[PDB]
Design an enzyme around this catalytic site. Structure first.
Site, PDB file in Angstrom:
ATOM      1  N   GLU A  36       0.833  -1.188   0.000  1.00 24.90           N
ATOM      2  CA  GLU A  36       0.000   0.000   0.000  1.00 24.90           C
ATOM      3  C   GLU A  36       0.877   1.252   0.000  1.00 24.90           C
ATOM      4  OE1 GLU A  36      -3.144  -0.769   3.104  1.00 24.90           O
ATOM      5  OE2 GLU A  36      -3.416  -2.489   1.790  1.00 24.90           O
ATOM      6  N   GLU A  84      -2.407  -7.481  -3.698  1.00 23.40           N
ATOM      7  CA  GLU A  84      -1.720  -6.231  -3.426  1.00 23.40           C
ATOM      8  C   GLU A  84      -0.205  -6.352  -3.612  1.00 23.40           C
ATOM      9  OE1 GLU A  84      -2.905  -4.213   0.220  1.00 23.40           O
ATOM     10  OE2 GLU A  84      -5.011  -4.709  -0.133  1.00 23.40           O
ATOM     11  N   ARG A 118     -11.151  -8.201  -0.616  1.00 21.92           N
ATOM     12  CA  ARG A 118     -11.798  -7.303   0.332  1.00 21.92           C
ATOM     13  C   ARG A 118     -11.995  -5.931  -0.299  1.00 21.92           C
ATOM     14  NH1 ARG A 118      -6.684  -5.466   4.295  1.00 21.92           N
ATOM     15  NH2 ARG A 118      -5.406  -4.628   2.573  1.00 21.92           N
ATOM     16  N   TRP A 160     -10.141   2.768  15.625  1.00 21.26           N
ATOM     17  CA  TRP A 160      -9.339   2.490  14.436  1.00 21.26           C
ATOM     18  C   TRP A 160     -10.127   2.560  13.118  1.00 21.26           C
ATOM     19  CZ3 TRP A 160     -10.241  -1.318  18.263  1.00 21.26           C
ATOM     20  CH2 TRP A 160     -11.191  -2.290  17.901  1.00 21.26           C
ATOM     21  N   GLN A 253      -1.318   2.518  10.502  1.00 23.50           N
ATOM     22  CA  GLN A 253      -1.163   2.706   9.077  1.00 23.50           C
ATOM     23  C   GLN A 253      -2.352   3.219   8.235  1.00 23.50           C
ATOM     24  OE1 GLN A 253      -2.392   0.474   6.536  1.00 23.50           O
ATOM     25  NE2 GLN A 253      -1.096   1.149   4.804  1.00 23.50           N
ATOM     26  N   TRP A 303       3.936  -0.020  25.310  1.00 23.40           N
ATOM     27  CA  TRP A 303       3.601  -1.403  25.624  1.00 23.40           C
ATOM     28  C   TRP A 303       4.868  -2.245  25.909  1.00 23.40           C
ATOM     29  CZ3 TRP A 303      -0.514  -3.783  27.200  1.00 23.40           C
ATOM     30  CH2 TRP A 303      -0.663  -5.183  27.034  1.00 23.40           C
ATOM     31  N   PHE A 356      -0.313   3.473  22.970  1.00 16.97           N
ATOM     32  CA  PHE A 356       0.485   2.327  22.572  1.00 16.97           C
ATOM     33  C   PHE A 356       1.789   2.847  22.019  1.00 16.97           C
ATOM     34  CE2 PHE A 356       0.972  -1.215  19.214  1.00 16.97           C
ATOM     35  CZ  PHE A 356       1.309  -2.208  20.130  1.00 16.97           C
ATOM     36  N   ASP A 365      -5.353   3.760  25.440  1.00 16.57           N
ATOM     37  CA  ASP A 365      -6.121   2.533  25.564  1.00 16.57           C
ATOM     38  C   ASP A 365      -5.992   1.938  26.952  1.00 16.57           C
ATOM     39  OD1 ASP A 365      -3.356   1.695  24.277  1.00 16.57           O
ATOM     40  OD2 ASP A 365      -4.167  -0.128  25.235  1.00 16.57           O
ATOM     41  N   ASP A 367      -5.712  -1.168  27.864  1.00 16.41           N
ATOM     42  CA  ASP A 367      -4.661  -2.170  27.995  1.00 16.41           C
ATOM     43  C   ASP A 367      -3.316  -1.544  28.369  1.00 16.41           C
ATOM     44  OD1 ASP A 367      -4.292  -4.854  28.136  1.00 16.41           O
ATOM     45  OD2 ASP A 367      -4.225  -5.233  25.982  1.00 16.41           O
ATOM     46  N   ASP A 368      -2.840  -0.597  27.566  1.00 13.09           N
ATOM     47  CA  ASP A 368      -1.576   0.069  27.865  1.00 13.09           C
ATOM     48  C   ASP A 368      -1.644   0.730  29.238  1.00 13.09           C
ATOM     49  OD1 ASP A 368       0.637   0.175  25.737  1.00 13.09           O
ATOM     50  OD2 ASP A 368      -1.160   0.470  24.523  1.00 13.09           O
ATOM     51  N   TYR A 411     -10.497   1.186  23.655  1.00 15.06           N
ATOM     52  CA  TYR A 411     -10.494   2.630  23.479  1.00 15.06           C
ATOM     53  C   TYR A 411     -11.744   3.388  23.941  1.00 15.06           C
ATOM     54  CZ  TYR A 411      -6.384   1.558  20.620  1.00 15.06           C
ATOM     55  OH  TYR A 411      -5.159   1.131  20.167  1.00 15.06           O
ATOM     56  N   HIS A 442      -6.233  -7.943  32.402  1.00 16.14           N
ATOM     57  CA  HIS A 442      -5.097  -7.075  32.663  1.00 16.14           C
ATOM     58  C   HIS A 442      -5.473  -5.973  33.634  1.00 16.14           C
ATOM     59  CE1 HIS A 442      -3.174  -8.267  28.555  1.00 16.14           C
ATOM     60  NE2 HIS A 442      -2.906  -9.138  29.513  1.00 16.14           N
ATOM     61  N   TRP A 480      -6.542  -9.961  21.651  1.00 12.86           N
ATOM     62  CA  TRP A 480      -5.338  -9.314  21.121  1.00 12.86           C
ATOM     63  C   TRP A 480      -4.085 -10.166  21.242  1.00 12.86           C
ATOM     64  CZ3 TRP A 480      -6.537  -4.734  18.753  1.00 12.86           C
ATOM     65  CH2 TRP A 480      -7.730  -4.119  19.133  1.00 12.86           C
ATOM     66  N   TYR A 486      -3.387 -17.498  25.401  1.00 17.75           N
ATOM     67  CA  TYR A 486      -3.150 -16.104  25.741  1.00 17.75           C
ATOM     68  C   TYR A 486      -4.199 -15.591  26.716  1.00 17.75           C
ATOM     69  CZ  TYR A 486      -2.681 -11.038  25.291  1.00 17.75           C
ATOM     70  OH  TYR A 486      -2.502  -9.695  25.549  1.00 17.75           O
ATOM     71  N   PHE A 592      -6.908  -8.510  14.473  1.00 18.79           N
ATOM     72  CA  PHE A 592      -8.327  -8.790  14.326  1.00 18.79           C
ATOM     73  C   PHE A 592      -8.414 -10.296  14.195  1.00 18.79           C
ATOM     74  CE2 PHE A 592      -8.389  -4.631  11.798  1.00 18.79           C
ATOM     75  CZ  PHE A 592      -8.705  -3.885  12.935  1.00 18.79           C
ATOM     76  N   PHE A 596      -6.225 -10.112  10.703  1.00 15.20           N
ATOM     77  CA  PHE A 596      -4.963  -9.396  10.810  1.00 15.20           C
ATOM     78  C   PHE A 596      -4.192  -9.882  12.025  1.00 15.20           C
ATOM     79  CE2 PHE A 596      -2.363  -5.456  11.448  1.00 15.20           C
ATOM     80  CZ  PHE A 596      -1.856  -5.341  10.161  1.00 15.20           C
ATOM     81  N   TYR A 600       4.811  -9.655  17.783  1.00 14.79           N
ATOM     82  CA  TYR A 600       5.425  -8.781  18.774  1.00 14.79           C
ATOM     83  C   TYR A 600       6.819  -9.303  19.079  1.00 14.79           C
ATOM     84  CZ  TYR A 600       0.943  -6.424  19.833  1.00 14.79           C
ATOM     85  OH  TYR A 600      -0.225  -5.704  19.754  1.00 14.79           O
TER      86      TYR A 600
HETATM   87  C1  LIG Z   1      -1.113  -5.932  22.857  1.00 11.62           C
HETATM   88  C2  LIG Z   1      -2.131  -5.381  23.522  1.00 11.62           C
HETATM   89  C3  LIG Z   1      -3.371  -4.857  22.840  1.00 11.62           C
HETATM   90  N1  LIG Z   1      -3.867  -3.618  23.476  1.00 11.62           N
HETATM   91  C4  LIG Z   1      -5.288  -3.356  23.051  1.00 11.62           C
HETATM   92  C5  LIG Z   1      -2.960  -2.455  23.192  1.00 11.62           C
HETATM   93  C6  LIG Z   1      -3.170  -1.801  21.840  1.00 11.62           C
HETATM   94  C7  LIG Z   1      -2.556  -2.179  20.721  1.00 11.62           C
HETATM   95  C8  LIG Z   1      -2.796  -1.498  19.405  1.00 11.62           C
HETATM   96  O1  LIG Z   1      -3.929  -2.121  18.777  1.00 11.62           O
HETATM   97  C9  LIG Z   1      -3.992  -2.048  17.360  1.00 11.62           C
HETATM   98  C10 LIG Z   1      -5.264  -2.187  16.717  1.00 11.62           C
HETATM   99  C11 LIG Z   1      -5.394  -2.132  15.290  1.00 11.62           C
HETATM  100  C12 LIG Z   1      -4.232  -1.936  14.517  1.00 11.62           C
HETATM  101  C13 LIG Z   1      -3.955  -1.837  13.102  1.00 11.62           C
HETATM  102  C14 LIG Z   1      -4.892  -1.932  11.932  1.00 11.62           C
HETATM  103  C15 LIG Z   1      -4.506  -2.698  10.795  1.00 11.62           C
HETATM  104  C16 LIG Z   1      -5.372  -2.807   9.687  1.00 11.62           C
HETATM  105  C17 LIG Z   1      -6.619  -2.156   9.711  1.00 11.62           C
HETATM  106 BR1  LIG Z   1      -7.730  -2.294   8.270  1.00 11.62          BR
HETATM  107  C18 LIG Z   1      -7.022  -1.388  10.833  1.00 11.62           C
HETATM  108  C19 LIG Z   1      -6.157  -1.276  11.944  1.00 11.62           C
HETATM  109  C20 LIG Z   1      -2.631  -1.645  13.020  1.00 11.62           C
HETATM  110  O2  LIG Z   1      -2.042  -1.618  14.259  1.00 11.62           O
HETATM  111  C21 LIG Z   1      -2.981  -1.794  15.171  1.00 11.62           C
HETATM  112  C22 LIG Z   1      -2.816  -1.844  16.568  1.00 11.62           C
END
Ligand SMILES: C=CCN(C)C/C=C/COc1ccc2c(-c3ccc(Br)cc3)coc2c1
Ligand SMILES: C=CCN(C)C/C=C/COc1ccc2c(-c3ccc(Br)cc3)coc2c1
Ligand SMILES: CCCCCCCCOCCOCCOCCOCCO
Ligand SMILES: CCCCCCCCOCCOCCOCCOCCO
Lengths: 619, 619
Positions: A36, A84, A118, A160, A253, A303, A356, A365, A367-368, A411, A442, A480, A486, A592, A596, A600
């Site tokens: 992209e 892509e 998609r 997001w 992104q 994080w 994050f 967020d 989580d963080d 969020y 958490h 996540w 996990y 997701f 996705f 880490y």
């Molecule tokens: C590890 C703990 C999770 N907690 C929660 C902390 C937050 C983490 C960040 O969450 C995200 C959440 C979503 C994304 C995307 C993303 C990628 C493709 C599309 Br389409 C939309 C978003 C890219 O990076 C991302 C990061």
């Protein structure tokens, strides 16, 4: 025995710490990021021949024997990702002949071609004119008029998704086309007989939205769209107000790229915001030693740092170790003190969360925030004033973020609408941000550290949530993080920390489930397929992180002195490298479910260290 | 004779040219710039001890024997300027005792104290809490709701006033106070018996506006202001959309400073627009060789370059001189191609103008555009394509900019409302941007270079404008240049260029007026007092620029071979320095008649060269 494993893991972590005092491992995803990017550069007419080169090595390097690219390493070929990547390469210079282009093209054809990808993929292609805009689900600028409490107002979407929707409405409003040179046109993406297997909206497409879309595409054809001019400026202004410090949008992104394209569309290339958003990109890039270049979907400094600390502590380092102080101080300077999009549902809630990435104030967020606050609670810093204060703000904010079911989202609060899941546009990943077991866990473990137990109503309401969400086999979904290992690891560890009794039936029923999936090699592993097909739940190649997760579940539930327990410790001790780290060729992170996945980089070192630090504790 | 003077002046200008190919002389004004800067730094809590020092030397250095500061050098002490400089110093460290503080203070008191200062001055003081906000003319965010065609909508104000009004409505909306340490409180500014001599609105204060204000200050006291939230955000977005590339706002000190303060008010010190707006400041600063530091009210790169070229050409250099090509090329890259605030009155007009500063796309002005286009017209650049094209765009834009009366304004078309001039707030300088003789003249002379004579209706309508605006004694007011010598010089030179007959009665009646004010020393000079008291029109110490202006008037009107003519040439040839330049301890530039004067550093070198270049022509 393991003690050496620890001393070696520790010194390794400490060596990875940057000067400023934080940890920052790269974030792995898939090639659609770089693919992209290439396209973005073309749209903005800012192509660097040398960069393309580095990107070509990467793309190829990532392609598999069969000539495809997957979401996670060792996963099924992905159509969208491969389409892509294909286009990306052809534009960089490849010819449809070359071995790689060949293998890919055939896999793409064997899938129904471009008509099976998609929305995003078809949209990007629409942008360079390789796909008719008419066939792309329409999202109008006018969506900007829906009130705070209305069907589909932008705040019914996940954070997001939100920014992306706004930036896109401007783009789809104009339906611009940035032609590619003939050399890269990809008509061949249509050349297929296989029936196009269309992916539909996440939660099914009611005939209503279907009609509504056709409706919008028709209205789009009119000569006059009253107030559209205003709907656009509304969107633009929404974007201009929220731009992040590093110039991104949300530090992710997608919207970042779309927003940039949208400004380009509005002849704002020489406006401060555009310039900054453009220059910001470089920070997310990464030089690959083999010559390639990759772009991070997001960045996890906060994080990484947060977990780093906790691991090193549970490990053994002094709560005032001068190296951890560097981190603690750093973390304090990160706390967000201004209203974010979350304030729309919590106006009287005082700011105090964390993000994050480095500088993203409008999107802290839970989580963080939970991990950071808790990690601080384990340190003794010079300015006990600010530490005390920081914690309290974050804490209160976390409490005010709790949702209606006693659980916690990431969020927003009760970002649980179902409406968005049916729009034709939403056929990828998550679109809403509802409460999840892992975040909730958490949080509970954070409060746990402070001592707040099951007595406090907040803690109970939450436990009730978890208790009701548990799976039949006693496991907990990993939103996540891949996946049941996990989640179950999270919950149990958490419940243990909030005073609950590890002996309860449901708790035991979970620990049992854990011992039950231990691999022959003593460790645990769960493949990303566990999101698509259940037979994979808790099954997969053993990884240092997932092993460390199952260990924490076991250590917490009392079974620390078990067979499976000591067995898993062995795995970590043996598999460890001479330098102290661990390897992990698999993704253990989840963006997701089913769409996705993320790798880490630091997980392989931190969780093993935290699990080991907690085992050395049980003795 | 003079030939050497020219050769010398030419090589000197050519030595002042920067590498990129442009000319850029500093812009002088008065100490309120640096004084307000000090205060700004305090508000933003970003004070650099070292910078403060450099500003103290400067402030002092500029103070006079009597302990006061004036608008122009050798002018009457100015209260506002002196009040602001006083406070600045006291904050930097001075004690109310020290000689400088004493003299000033007494002058301030002998004037009625703080109660006699312009709104801005009282407002700044209000901001640091040395003056009650209640007594400051109120400008509400709600002004943001007036439509395009309504009494007092923000587009009824001049471009420079507009941005300030917007930024301020946010500030006045909150009426914030940033206390000064006790050490700098200036209660002593009240300690006076003299009756406060209040300055009123520019055009007089009808009892209506008087009441309305009282009304507003009352409504300001209510507990609930419905939609104010939105009026503010309307303003904020308006600002965010218009920020210039350098991070300024309009490339002028005022709005830029106010906008920054406004963002600070909204907890947006971590937002891109602010960071960029803040870092941008440095570019306008100037290190003074004696240790001081000054801040430019604005910057004239484009303008300087434009005239530089014209002078060097009229002087003699080849239309394709490699050193002028550097400039021509540079200038081309400057042309603005996107809609600016001017589009609100000319939607079908194609962009093509130019700005005064480096990067300020939303505010191109007719004056710069005319000079630039014309200067290009005189060159022969490699890419005759772009030169041809660029010119055309600019030309068209200029034409489409002509106002109702055949005259030309600076930034907008028919920005001639009278309403704004009566608001209590507007007690300083100009508030509207109506057509003026000098701009109109520069335009005519631009077209003139192409050929378009008096035949073309455009030209005529304009000449009619000038003819009707001429003064009884045959002179023409100087709006952006001190003064009648400046204007008359412009007009006549223009009229000559558009084919008109230099022999006409009114033309002759002008040239006569010129010859009549020639100073004994053979040159001409007009002091800035000529805006306050007529006896000074055409009167004042001789300056290289003003002399060069009167010469152009004479050379154009045929009287090139006159006594007065050759007399003035002598002055220049003699007064010229050994290096080639000229000195000029007086301001010849005008910001606002009677309120704000500017010193154009390059004038002293360019105009003498252009006048000489044109004399060498008449032979
Ligand atoms: C590890 C703990 C999770 N907690 C929660 C902390 C937050 C983490 C960040 O969450 C995200 C959440 C979503 C994304 C995307 C993303 C990628 C493709 C599309 Br389409 C939309 C978003 C890219 O990076 C991302 C990061
Ligand atoms: C020399 C030719 C004039 N022609 C037209 C070109 C435009 C020049 C820019 O005009 C301005 C016009 C106004 C300002 C201010 C200013 C200073 C104080 C306040 Br209060 C408001 C504005 C500061 O710098 C300025 C510059
Ligand atoms: C002009 C209002 C300033 C008060 C700020 C409170 C804003 C409440 O947030 C609601 C929605 O906006 C989400 C937050 O990010 C907003 C950034 O805009 C900055 C100040 O308006
Ligand atoms: C989304 C609409 C973009 C088209 C804007 C042109 C509107 C006409 O100009 C009105 C005056 O405002 C000046 C515009 O440039 C300033 C920045 O606003 C950004 C979008 O153009």
């Amino acid at each position: 025995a393991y003690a050496r494993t620890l001393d070696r893991a520790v010194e390794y972590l400490l060596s990875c710490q940057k000067d400023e005092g934080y940890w920052w491992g790269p974030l792995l995803s898939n090639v659609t990021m770089e693919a992209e990017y290439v396209l973005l550069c073309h749209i903005l007419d800012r192509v660097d021949r040398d960069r393309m080169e580095k990107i070509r090595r990467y793309l190829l390097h990532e392609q598999r024997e069969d000539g495809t690219w997957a979401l996670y390493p060792g996963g099924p070929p992905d159509l969208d990702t491969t389409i892509e990547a294909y286009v990306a390469l052809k534009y960089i210079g490849m010819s449809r002949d070359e071995e790689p282009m060949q293998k890919a093209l055939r896999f793409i054809q064997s899938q129904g071609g471009i008509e099976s990808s998609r929305v995003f993929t078809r949209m990007w292609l629409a942008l360079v004119g390789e796909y008719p805009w008419e066939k792309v689900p329409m999202v109008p600028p006018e969506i900007m008029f829906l009130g705070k409490r209305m069907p589909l107002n932008i705040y019914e979407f996940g954070s997001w998704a939100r920014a992306t929707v706004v930036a896109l409405s401007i783009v789809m409003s104009r339906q611009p086309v940035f032609p590619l040179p003939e050399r890269a046109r990809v008509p061949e993406l249509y050349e297929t007989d296989v029936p196009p297997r269309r992916r539909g909206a996440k939660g099914g497409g009611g005939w209503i939205f279907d009609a509504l879309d056709r409706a919008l595409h028709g209205y789009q054809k009119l000569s006059v769209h009253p107030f559209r001019r205003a709907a656009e400026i509304r969107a633009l202004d929404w974007l201009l107000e929220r731009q992040a410090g590093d110039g991104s949008w949300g530090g992710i992104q997608p919207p970042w790229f779309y927003a940039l394209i949208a400004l380009k569309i509005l002849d704002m290339t020489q406006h401060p915001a555009f310039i900054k958003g453009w220059e910001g990109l470089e920070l997310y890039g990464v030089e690959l030693d083999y010559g390639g270049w990759m772009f991070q979907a997001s960045i996890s400094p906060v994080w990484d740092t947060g977990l780093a600390v906790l691991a090193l502590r549970a490990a053994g380092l002094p709560a005032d170790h001068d190296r951890l102080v560097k981190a603690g101080e750093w973390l304090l300077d990160r706390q967000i003190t201004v209203p974010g999009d979350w304030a729309v549902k919590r106006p009287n809630l005082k700011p105090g969360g964390f993000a994050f990435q480095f500088d993203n104030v409008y999107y802290p967020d839970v989580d963080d925030t939970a991990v950071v606050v808790w990690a601080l609670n384990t340190l003794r810093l010079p300015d006990e004033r600010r530490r005390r204060d920081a914690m309290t703000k974050g804490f209160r904010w976390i409490v005010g973020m709790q949702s209606s079911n006693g659980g916690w989202g990431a969020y927003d609060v009760d970002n649980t609408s179902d409406l968005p899941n049916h729009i034709p546009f939403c056929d990828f990943g998550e679109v809403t941000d509802p409460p999840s077991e892992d975040v909730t866990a958490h949080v509970l473990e954070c409060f746990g550290s402070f001592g707040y137990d099951d007595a406090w109503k907040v803690i109970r309401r939450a436990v009730e949530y978890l208790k009701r969400e548990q799976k039949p086999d006693g496991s907990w979904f990993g939103r996540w993080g891949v996946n049941y290992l996990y989640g179950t690891g999270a919950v149990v560890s958490a419940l243990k920390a909030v005073g609950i009794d590890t002996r309860e039936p449901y708790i035991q029923k979970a620990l049992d489930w854990v011992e039950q999936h231990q691999n022959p090699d003593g460790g645990w592993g769960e493949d990303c397929r566990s999101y698509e097909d259940p037979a994979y739940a808790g099954k997969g190649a053993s990884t240092p992180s997932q092993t460390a997760w199952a260990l924490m579940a076991l250590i917490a539930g009392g079974r620390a002195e078990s067979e499976a327990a000591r067995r898993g410790v062995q795995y970590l001790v043996e598999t460890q490298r001479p330098d102290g780290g661990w390897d992990e060729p698999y993704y253990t992170g989840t963006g997701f479910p089913g769409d996705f996945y993320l790798g880490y980089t630091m997980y392989r070192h931190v969780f093993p260290t935290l699990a080991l630090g907690r085992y050395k504790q049980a003795i």
